[PDB]
Amino acid sequence: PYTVVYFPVRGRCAALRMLLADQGQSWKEEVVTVETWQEGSLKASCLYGQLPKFQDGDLTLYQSNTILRHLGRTLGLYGKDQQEAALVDMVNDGVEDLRCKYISLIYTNYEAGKDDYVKALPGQLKPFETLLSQNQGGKTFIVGDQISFADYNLLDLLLIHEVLAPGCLDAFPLLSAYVGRLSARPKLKAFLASPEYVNLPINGNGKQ
Amino acid sequence: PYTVVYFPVRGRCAALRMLLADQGQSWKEEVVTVETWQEGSLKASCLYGQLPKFQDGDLTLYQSNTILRHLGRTLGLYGKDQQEAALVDMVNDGVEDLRCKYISLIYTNYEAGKDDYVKALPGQLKPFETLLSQNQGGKTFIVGDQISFADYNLLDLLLIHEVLAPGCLDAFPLLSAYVGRLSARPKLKAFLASPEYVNLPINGNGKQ
Ligand SMILES: N[C@@H](CCC(=O)N[C@@H](CS)C(=O)NCC(=O)O)C(=O)O
Ligand SMILES: N[C@@H](CCC(=O)N[C@@H](CS)C(=O)NCC(=O)O)C(=O)O
Numbered sequence: 001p002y003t004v005v006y007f008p009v010r011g012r013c014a015a016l017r018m019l020l021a022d023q024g025q026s027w028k029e030e031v032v033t034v035e036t037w038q039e040g041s042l043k044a045s046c047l048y049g050q051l052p053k054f055q056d057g058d059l060t061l062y063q064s065n066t067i068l069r070h071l072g073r074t075l076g077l078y079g080k081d082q083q084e085a086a087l088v089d090m091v092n093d094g095v096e097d098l099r100c101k102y103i104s105l106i107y108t109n110y111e112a113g114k115d116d117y118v119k120a121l122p123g124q125l126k127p128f129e130t131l132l133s134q135n136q137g138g139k140t141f142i143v144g145d146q147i148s149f150a151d152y153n154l155l156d157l158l159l160i161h162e163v164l165a166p167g168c169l170d171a172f173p174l175l176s177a178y179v180g181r182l183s184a185r186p187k188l189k190a191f192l193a194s195p196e197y198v199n200l201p202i203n204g205n206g207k208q
Numbered sequence: 209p210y211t212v213v214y215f216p217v218r219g220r221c222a223a224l225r226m227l228l229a230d231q232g233q234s235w236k237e238e239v240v241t242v243e244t245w246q247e248g249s250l251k252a253s254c255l256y257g258q259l260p261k262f263q264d265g266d267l268t269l270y271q272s273n274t275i276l277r278h279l280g281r282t283l284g285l286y287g288k289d290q291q292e293a294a295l296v297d298m299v300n301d302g303v304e305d306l307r308c309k310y311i312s313l314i315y316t317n318y319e320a321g322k323d324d325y326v327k328a329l330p331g332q333l334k335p336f337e338t339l340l341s342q343n344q345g346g347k348t349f350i351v352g353d354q355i356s357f358a359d360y361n362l363l364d365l366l367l368i369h370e371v372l373a374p375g376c377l378d379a380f381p382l383l384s385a386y387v388g389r390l391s392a393r394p395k396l397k398a399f400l401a402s403p404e405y406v407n408l409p410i411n412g413n414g415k416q
Contacts, residue, residue: 047335048302059291063301070294083267086278093271094256100308127255 002027004067005053007037009204010197012064012099013052015156016071019149021191023075065096065153072149080144087143091131091150095157098124102160103203110207118165125161128154129172138174147182155182163208210235212275213261215245217412218405220272220307221260223364224279227357229399231283237404273304273361280357288352295351299339299358303365306332310368318415326373333369336362337380346382355390363390371416 002020006013008031020027032051036042043049047062054061054070061067072078072088079085101124105117132138141151158179161168169176183189191197202208210228214221216239228235240259244250251257255270262269262278269275280286280296287293309332313325340346349359366387369376377384391397399405410416 047298047338048305059294061294061298063298066294066297066301069297070290073290073293082278082281085281086267086269086274089274089277090255090269090271093274097256130255 001057003030003055004028005030005032005055006051007032007204008200010156010160010200010202011204014160014197014202015149015153016052016054016064016067017197018156018188018191019068019071019075019077019152022147022152022185022188023071023077024187025075065092068092068149068153077146077148077151079148080146084144084148088148088150091128091142092153094127095150095153099157102157102164106203106207107205118168121161121165121168122171125158125168125172125175128158129175132174132178138178142178151182155179159183160202160208163202209265211238211263212236213238213240213263214259215240215412216408218364218368218408218410219412222368222405222410223357223361224260224262224272224275225405226364226396226399227276227279227283227285227360230355230360230393230396231279231285232395233283273300276300276357276361285354285356285359287356288354292352292356296356296358299336299350300361302335303358303361307365310365310372314411314415315413322372326376329369329373329376330379333366333376333380333383336366337383340382340386346386350386359390363387367391368410368416371410 002025004013004016004027006029010017017027032042037051046053050062052062052064052067054067056070056074059070061070069078069092079088101117105113128142129138131142135141135143136145141147142154143150155178158169158175162179169179183192210233212221212224212235214237218225225235240250245259254261258270260270260272260275262275264278264282269278277286277300287296309325313321336350337346339350343349343351344353349355350362351358363386366377366383370387377387391400
């Protein structure tokens with residue numbers, strides 16, 4: 001079955017976890033501690049020297065988006081055809097791009113860069129609102145009429161940004177409604193409210 | 209057919225171009241000039257305000273890796289099964305990660321950061337050598353026994369790094385042989401030697 005090896009934080013595992021929870025899939029969590037990481041062996045055994053590490057049977061994966069695409073592929077959350085699959089990738093690449101900027105701020109220069117980051121945030125969120133406006137008035141999902149792995153990744157990105165900049169979605173009606181709608185999905189709602197999710201920090205340096 | 213809209217540089221379009229050339233596909237190049245970009249209208253019309261922009265029929269795409277995955281998916285260069293597709297993604301994510309570091313150096317702090325970057329390079333290339341060593345002794349491709357879009361992306365990454373740090377592949381027999389072998393593919397060889405490729409700078413700021 002599934003095993004996710006990661007630090008005790010939501011981080012880059014939050015989206016795939018929401019995905020697995022919402023899809024009614026079971027998985028095992030293998031928590032890695034500082035001591036363990038700092039010990040070096042595990043790290044050295046990781047393809048790119050980083051976590052998450054994911055196991056699906058004897059298939060061992062690295063890279064959060066690889067895991068997301070794998071689950072999307074095997075679980076049927078990658079578009080209804082090749083055209084939708086491409087749009088799904090386009091959304092996820094966009095999500096990853098903003099996530100990289102967010103991670104840089106959080107771990108690299110939170111104090112000094114927070115103001116500029118937040119001023120620039122609307123410009124960075126606009127593209128997703130636009131995608132939403134172009135797909136059934138933004139009443140279903142980010143791509144097509146079925147959920148995809150990019151939805152889970154985008155939802156996570158929006159969630160962590162509302163904590164960083166409360167009300168940043170006030171300027172985007174479709175995105176706001178989207179967050180509320182997806183967050184209300186029964187299995188996802190229960191997971192998001194659980195101690196398993198709630199009691200984990202968003203990041204590893206205590207900033208958010 | 210295919211149309212790629214980009215600046216007159218290899219950059220993030222080099223890999224998908226090598227792919228199209230090697231696969232015997234025809235495409236149109238729409239070159240964007242400073243004046244044109246600086247004008248602002250094109251940029252404003254881009255999903256994430258960036259190029260490349262790709263067109264396949266009435267399907268318009270953005271993000272270099274989205275285009276690579278699209279072509280890999282539609283042309284059959286995405287693994288023989290779901291397991292291989294996942295490994296292909298894992299390699300590409302790794303390639304993208306190093307590419308991001310390379311781009312940062314090139315455009316952000318070439319002079320001051322080149323020494324440290326080059327010292328750290330071996331550690332960054334090691335994972336791809338290992339992947340090769342684990343796939344048929346590294347005698348075929350990065351994943352499986354058929355070429356995939358990750359191969360073209362990795363090949364490009366290795367090619368631009370040899371220019372940045374000549375001989376960086378010397379200590380990696382599999383990667384070295386891999387570059388030579390793939391570069392020798394008839395259609396790819398002809399394309400790489402053509403003025404269309406050769407007379408284009410690697411980057412846009414004249415550094416390499
Ligand atoms: N591109 C990778 C990034 C992985 C990454 O940044 N991992 C961090 C934590 S989220 C890590 O392993 N840090 C420990 C280290 O680099 O030694 C992915 O998407 O999974
Ligand atoms: N994640 C995007 C990055 C695209 C990107 O960085 N584009 C640059 C040139 S390679 C650009 O459009 N720069 C102009 C601008 O940002 O205004 C991709 O993979 O295509």
